Amino acid sequence: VIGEKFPEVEVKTTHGVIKLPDYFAEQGKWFVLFSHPADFTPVCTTEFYAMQKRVDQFRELGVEPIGLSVDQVFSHIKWMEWIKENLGEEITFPVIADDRGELADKLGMIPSGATITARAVFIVDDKGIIRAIVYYPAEVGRDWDEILRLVKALKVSDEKGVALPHKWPNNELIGDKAIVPPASTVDEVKQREEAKAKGEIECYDWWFCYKKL
Template identity: 50%
Template sequence: MEQKEQHTQQATGLPRIGEKAPDFTAQTTHGEITLDDYKGQWFILFSHPSDFTPVCTTEFVGFQNIYEQLRALNTELIGLSIDSVTSHIAWIKNIEENFDTKIEFPVIADLNKDVATKFGMIMPESNGTETSRAVFVIDDKGTIRAVIYYPLSTGRNMDEMVRLVEALQTTDEHGVSTPADWKKGEQVIVSPPKTTEEAKTRMESPDYECTDWYFCKKNI
């Protein structure tokens, strides 16, 4: 079973949550970038199937709309598809003209599929060269913190991109977890107590809102 899982991982090239992001050097609409360029800051690397396509166009407008929110969270954006720099530039110009949106983040021109392969953005069962709608959230230590895949027909939710980064950074800063549908400023979940005495103390403390001994929230 273990050998089979290892073989599957090698075949798909999909990095896992908690692993270091694969090293890369890539040509983009902002010139050459490398993984080292993002030391000390978070970034979201996302792939799109192709330039000049409707759903991808709405996503690029959406990503640009949240770009300032992400930058306020020390988080950069990097787009990617298996198109040329020339194609990217022409499409970005088209988006600016037709949707009054200037794309400010770099877009990787991954013609040799090097970055897409390292990040498992091309499905092994696919005969095409389109990259999937993949999202990788990578923290300021170069560790992959979240991986999300969407089908080609479904555009991504931009509010979730911001919420996810805020939740991960809140976990890092306060050592807590976040419940379903959590938004910044709401109560967080604390880990279950390790002793009966700790459980009793927590249940009686005004600092916690406990539904049961194992389920407590608090404000931060």
């Protein structure tokens, strides 16, 4: 569940034995953890390919990607050699060999009826706080562009203490403008009008206010 710290938990990965979330957190970095059913499978492969393609967009935001399945490291690597040779993309982000699903269990990555992970995504910042969560089925690949929009929103949201409208930065109504957290007190309301008159923010109403970054 959201807002909880991330379990302090150690993982065997393709790039080494690492400590979570300490390894990313101590480096200022955030990370998007995501789980896939099984190495050497179709949909899963389309997703890995696509992440690699976008790895520098995530990374460039200070956001480290990392995958995970119940498979063992040797089939992880082998499958990644495959993507380098048949799709021609060297996979460059770490993958978790989640042994027996130690961690998957703890994170509710498993669906009803199952002993393998699903299609889960977790976004976790540099203070170890889980920020958002996604569970799609086996039968449907994710969209990393939606997962990308989200993170940017979050980054901005924290950096500027603002909310982001539906579909930001392409909101049909206020475009790429950021939303002012709606006011909750009568005195905070005077701060909204004080701001509208004099032109810092724009306001459909006292609760609905927005500005540019």
